[PDB]
């Protein structure tokens, strides 16, 4: 007695019409069962009549929640009414018995079916998938399922990008990488410009300062009193380098390099300057993000130290689950927490293993417990 079938896809809602009713007497015999697997036989049973794709991602999750609770969405109410005749009562097949009462309330003229005969058809509609759509644009179901899976799954947990903690791990890995490259490129700037004016490389040991001073002092021949004041403004004249660089620049052994050679050092030094500036920026981002994610750990020990501890465990969840002893050795290779000295380290390690928990398993962690946790570490400090 089945005429219409409601199927529901990640790309949309699909309604089917049942041309022929399979032998309900012989449902369990093999030959009718093989027809379900066979596409040629199944196409003779039903044929697609409606497909209404969801408008986009947001609407799909809203329906995915409604269908999970056996509710009729506005989109669902749209496709049925356009299709089911008003009519004694039109018979509809639905996979869910719980959805049945909801459909009946909206449409008094439809009687729902969820018996094994309906389940047999629903299985075969699903078995062929996009083949039954006769080429109607259904996207790709396997991909669409996977997207709604993260979307439908994550919704019930109330996970947040606030809970997300790997940004610290990327920031630390990027930060140390920046430092090595800032240093590595910077030694070159001393070599490239060292040929032209080697004495200056000794005068300004600070590599970041040296790159800036090379940028203005490109040619050591160019030396003016106003230029001396300009380079004097850089850093301070307390070290006296401003007078030394002039005096050294008047009289030096450095062999002049070409204009193209001088074009590279300032540009390549400019590259070093940008990375140092970005490393400063990324460092501040790392500082701010921990206070949001791990206020207790960041307050207890510090931002940079706390992040390095999290990266060692592989995640904030990993850090929390470890026992107190393991956390102590998790930072015992770079001395993060560092006979009486060891007692403070283990004591602080136990507290660090603690504040890691309050950050990880709280939806909006606060710093109230981190502060009272740190003073307890502080008090212990003066006793020993």
């Amino acid at each position: 007695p089945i005429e219409y079938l409601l199927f529901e896809e990640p790309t949309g809602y699909a309604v089917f019409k049942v041309k022929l009713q399979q032998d309900d007497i012989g449902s369990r015999l093999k030959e009718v069962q093989e027809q379900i697997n066979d596409f040629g036989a199944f196409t003779k049973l039903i044929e697609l009549v409606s497909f209404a794709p969801f408008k986009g991602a947001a609407e799909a999750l809203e329906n995915a929640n409604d269908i999970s609770e056996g509710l009729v969405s506005e989109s669902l109410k749209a496709i049925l009414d356009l299709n089911l005749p008003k009519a004694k009562n039109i018979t509809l097949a639905i996979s869910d018995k719980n959805l049945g009462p909801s459909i009946k309330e909206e449409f008094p003229y439809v009687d729902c079916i969820s018996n094994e005969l309906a389940q047999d058809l629903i299985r075969g509609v699903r078995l062929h998938g996009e083949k039954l759509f006769k080429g109607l644009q259904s996207g790709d179901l396997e991909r669409a399922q996977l997207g709604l899976g993260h979307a439908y799954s994550r919704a019930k947990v109330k996970f947040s990008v606030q809970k997300n903690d790997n940004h610290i791990i990327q920031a630390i890995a990027l930060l140390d990488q920046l430092d090595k490259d800032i240093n590595t490129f910077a030694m070159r700037v001393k070599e490239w410009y060292g040929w032209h004016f080697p004495e200056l490389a000794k005068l300004v040991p600070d590599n970041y300062t040296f790159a800036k001073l090379v940028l203005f002092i490109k040619d050591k021949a160019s030396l003016n009193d106003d230029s001396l004041h300009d380079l004097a403004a850089l850093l301070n004249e307390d070290s006296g380098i401003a007078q030394r660089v002039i005096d050294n620049a008047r009289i030096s052994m450095g062999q002049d390099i070409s204009e193209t050679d001088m074009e590279n050092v300032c540009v390549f030094a400019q590259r070093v300057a940008s990375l140092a500036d970005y490393r400063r920026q990324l460092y501040d981002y790392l500082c701010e993000k921990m206070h949001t994610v791990a206020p207790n750990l960041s307050e207890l020990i510090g931002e940079v130290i706390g992040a390095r501890l999290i990266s060692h465990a592989g995640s904030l969840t990993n850090l929390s689950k470890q026992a107190a002893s393991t956390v102590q050795i998790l930072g015992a290779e770079k001395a993060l927490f560092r006979k009486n000295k060891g007692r403070i380290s283990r004591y602080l390690a136990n507290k660090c293993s603690m504040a890691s928990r309050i950050d990880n398993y709280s939806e909006e962690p606060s710093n109230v417990f981190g502060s009272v946790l740190k003073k307890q570490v502080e008090q212990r400090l003066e006793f020993y």
Binding site: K77, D81, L82, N83, L84, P85, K86
Partner: peptide, 28 residues
């Protein structure tokens, strides 16, 4: 058979149907 040309709901299912219906009732 269900047809888009003729309404089969017998009541305003959307919020637009009631609004247009009120003017139709109010007009004449």
């Amino acid at each position: 058979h269900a047809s888009a040309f003729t309404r089969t709901q017998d009541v305003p299912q959307t919020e637009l149907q009631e609004k247009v219906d009120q003017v139709l009732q109010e007009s004449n």
